[PDB]
Amino acid sequence: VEQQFDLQKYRQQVRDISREDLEDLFIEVVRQKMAHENIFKGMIRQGS
């Protein structure tokens, strides 16, 4: 629910943004979800 709401406020925004301001928000994207894999790669690490 709330998430769906969120994504929409970000495309409610993004639309208004700019080649580089989405560039960084985008570079920042993969600059996080890789952490959202290591910090998700540790949490599955406990499969022992």
Next chain:
Amino acid sequence: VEQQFDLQKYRQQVRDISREDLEDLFIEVVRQKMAHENIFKGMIRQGS
């Protein structure tokens, strides 16, 4: 280290990508990240 290559690599792809076409990978993303949000969360209420 490695991911830092990853990063630099994801830059090139995006410093040529056009306006809207550099937008749809920011809408799919703030969906992305959140899917993990429920996942770390998922991961932390799985640990206790």
